[PDB]
Design a protein around this ligand. Structure first.
Ligand SMILES: [Mg+2]
Ligand SMILES: [Mg+2]
Ligand SMILES: [Mg+2]
Lengths: 429, 429, 429
């Protein structure tokens, strides 16, 4: 039911909010001005001009806003009652998808997936193994299979003294942000696209249950482990992100010298052939302009194809029977796969990227060990100094799992500069 | 008895030295030219122009020289026989107090009290725990509650081949230097000001017993753990040090931007009100000049008040019944406490000071562990290299406690530059 | 028999190669263009202009070429049949000795003998102790008493896919390169000069047995541990190396300020007195020119003396009864010993040299531990990253000893720059 999916409800609301009577734009406005989003300006994208996480978020938001606007147009033309009595507009869908896409990278720890694996391995085989017997199975699982999507949900909606609900985003935006509406256990029960990872920690189970019950998400789990169907706009958000990750990593790889210019045309002829102006392409004198020209065309065709695919399986998506992505139903699957493989071989496996990941591991391991050692023995002078350096903000009487997840969130959201400086101080440099 | 307190005896002397027949100035002259005192030029004062330990010592010596000169004037006017037959002058008292105050920071390890705690924790929970069973209780206590006052006494009077008695200072200067004339055990038996810490290690017990017996210090301990009353001039030395630590840390904090200018006048009106020239204060155009002007006034009034307090309780001080400091009997106690608390909150708890302390811990721990590992196994090539790098001076057949205390003294007296360079070499940088 | 000693056989040869029917010059040509030899341009000689390992190799090759040419002249005049029917020339001997001397430093790990001791201690008391029970006694011995001569033999003759036999040097060059033709066990069975160390690992036993059987080296071991007599030209190669190590370390020490100018003349008068032009020496205005002038004279007289000594004991050398070096039979033994001791006290025991050795230990230990930990568990993400960073070249199904010796060879042949960069990445800098 689309009426419940486009909920304007926020945390702490008592009276129901109706479309015909704050707005989805306000979510984007709040995310833009938020400190965690601003902090993305000092966070890199694990590549050797090259995009930072802030620009990637910006570009993803721009693709998601286009996808959502077109999808809202088509749904409003398919469900007249959504605008006749409920008063919804395609700009609403665009705003929801743009706000969800803008914050999709707000909780990811530095150094890419290597940082997530470092946080996981710290609690699996490192100093964090001591907490295994003091936590429940799902809590420990969250600790060992730490992902930045659950951390991003935590950042977007975590209460603090004087700020309940965090950014207080609308429930539609929160639902679109959740790509994996399931708990930390069981680990990958099936081949469904939404079961690859989890989207919320144990400290957010009640809040996401409230969000799902407000959005009317279908309960797909018959056991005691909660799991819901994906929000239909989460498909658009993820498709936008994949389109950017594919076409823009290739642009960045080509412009940085890691990928020769021939592969650009070689893997973009199929994508851009239907709309390329050959005279304009040949008239361009710089490689950067040509690759930008190709990137714009490819993004446009992929956006249109994703909109067509979404409207092809709307009923299946709303029922929860869709087990793959919108980009997986692409006619350009071979070219997309070839581009992704070439990017993996030339960028992600480059020395510079490997070197950086090896440093992240040592920095994150050191910081996590220092924070945990301070947590266990908060009486020594060195531990008091560590607490002052890394957690001067506040202190409270919380549980062990809350403290550990707070440590993980604080370490994940540090800027590369702040993390490196703290690691050097702790290492006496 | 003041005649015995103003002893001209030095180490190795056989014939008694009389005032009417080398001089207390010679102690100051020797300390100035000594290598350990010179080494203070490369040692910082754990603050982010800002005073180094050498300038702090200089300024403390200047306050102690004023206090001692006034106190000597008043005692000579109170005991005519001290000058009529013994031939003592107020310049003697000034010289003794100045020499004691100049060397009050000569044995402190770097990074402030954090370095002392690092040396203590190395032998308490670190690699140094292995020596607990091979040493006596007091020897191990000295190792684990290491203070820079005992190390300063060691530096001032430790024999070397060709140099017996070290700087060979007069016994009056050594007595005035000793703020805590007691052994390492028991640990804080009472609330007496002299029982807060200890002033000499176990390798200096015989020498300080000789010094105390020459100065006629009263034995306040009836057990087998020796402890004596404070030398009366030690009160003046400590009062001078506290006055500088209070008024000059505030000046440094104000001039460094950590403390706004308003608090200067706010906490100095009471101290300087009786002697401030308002026209001169308002005519000054720079904040540094105004704060210097206030610091000079406050130091003057505190010096006069300390002299008055010392002459108020002279008999009690000479009997050993005084359990507090001269600054503790101040009418400006509230303002002094407020200034100290503001300095603690704004300087000592600043990031930059915390960061520095966290680095000291790692550097001192690394250096101590390397030295100890070289000491236990002096056969490996790496350990021979470590011994050459850190202890090339000499080697001898000494006991385990002597070797450990020598390691602690050598690490404590390294310059920040030398310590950092050695730590980087050991860390392969 | 000199005919078999001057073998032109190379790895993989089936038909016998005769002198009268590729050439010993080709070995020098190949070594010059080889990547391992080129890599010596970025490797230092553990001294604070100062020689790198490449220039030391160059200079040693030049001394060995002179020694071999004179020795070949004298042998051809002593054995006419070597040139009458076999067709050998003195240039052959010169080429063999020069090629052997040029590669004498091609397998030495950085940081001098400190690096060799670090590799040994890693497997003796470090993380490498776990492999003791999984290897044979001699294999583990090779691991713990690792020397750069065996590694240099490995570099010169190790097969790779597409390159069998490595540089494919002539067997005479390989025999002259081998200073210690014996296995890793027993460790120093006697006082013979060839029994001080070993010259090949266990992975090269068959190849060196083939080389020795082709060269007709005398089997000096009656047990199951193979050991052969030294090749006669190995004496010349080692003598050349010692002459350079003695006279040129002194030149470098004098020119670097670690050795005053007086000792130059003081320890060179005896060596250069018979051929020095006093007018030329006094006319020189720079210390560098005078020391160069003295170095050239000393090298010349030592070369002539070494040739005379070699021809004095030719029969004893060819029978294998010579237990010392050519330089040990020198009339300038006292002056050579004095120069070596002065160099040890002033250069090798300098701070800068000690500091560098302390850093090597930490870098090599860190790199070896990382490589071994990657080897044991090649499933973790961090270990895969380490394998990509340090061993991206290739992978194969080899034994544990082969993998460990490959790790040791790869670490030993890294350039100081590459090693330091990898150590910093692993240390997160
Ligand atoms: Mg993305
Ligand atoms: Mg002081
Ligand atoms: Mg050599």
């Amino acid at each position: 039911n689309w009426e419940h999916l486009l909920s304007l409800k926020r945390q702490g609301d008592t009276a129901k909010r109706l479309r015909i009577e704050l707005g989805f734009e306000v979510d984007y406005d709040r995310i833009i001005f938020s400190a965690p989003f601003r902090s993305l300006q000092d966070k890199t994208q694990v590549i050797p001009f090259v995009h930072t996480r802030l620009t990637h978020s910006l570009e993803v938001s721009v693709v998601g806003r286009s996808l959502g606007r077109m999808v809202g147009k088509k749904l409003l033309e398919k469900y007249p009652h959504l605008e006749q009595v409920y008063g919804y507009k395609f700009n609403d869908f665009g705003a929801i998808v743009a706000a969800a896409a803008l914050a999709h990278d707000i909780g990811n720890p530095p150094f890419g997936h290597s940082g997530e694996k470092a946080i996981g391995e710290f609690f699996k085989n490192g100093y964090g193994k001591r907490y295994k017997d003091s936590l429940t199975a799902k809590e420990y699982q969250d600790l060992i299979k730490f992902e930045g999507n659950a951390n991003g949900f935590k950042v977007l909606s975590q209460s603090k003294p004087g700020a309940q609900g965090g950014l207080r985003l609308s429930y539609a935006t929160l639902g679109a942000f959740m790509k994996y509406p399931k708990e930390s256990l069981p680990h990958k029960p099936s081949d469904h696209i939404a079961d690859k990872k989890y989207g919320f920690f144990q400290s957010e189970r009640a809040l996401f249950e409230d969000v799902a019950q407000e959005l009317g998400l279908l309960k797909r789990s018959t056991t005691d482990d909660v799991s819901w169907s994906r929000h239909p706009l989460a498909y658009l958000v993820e498709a936008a992100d994949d389109i950017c990750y594919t076409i823009i990593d290739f642009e960045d790889g080509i412009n940085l010298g890691l990928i020769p210019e021939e592969y650009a045309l070689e893997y973009m002829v199929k994508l851009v052939g239907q709309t390329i102006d050959r005279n304009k392409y040949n008239a361009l004198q710089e490689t950067s302009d040509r690759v930008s020209y190709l990137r714009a065309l490819a993004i446009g065709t992929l956006i249109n194809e994703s909109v067509d695919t979404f409207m092809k399986y709307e009923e299946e998506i709303l029922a929860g029977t869709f087990d793959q992505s919108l980009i997986d139903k692409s006619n350009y699957q071979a070219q997309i796969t070839d581009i992704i493989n070439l990017s993996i071989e030339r960028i992600y496996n480059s020395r510079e990227v490997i070197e950086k990941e090896i440093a992240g591991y040592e920095i994150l391991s050191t910081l996590l060990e220092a924070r945990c050692r301070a947590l266990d023995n908060n009486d020594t002078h060195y531990n008091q100094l560590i607490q002052q350096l890394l957690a001067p903000n506040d202190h409270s009487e919380k549980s062990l799992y809350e403290n550990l997840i707070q440590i993980c969130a604080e370490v994940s959201t540090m800027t590369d500069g702040k993390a490196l400086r703290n690691y050097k101080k702790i290492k006496g440099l």
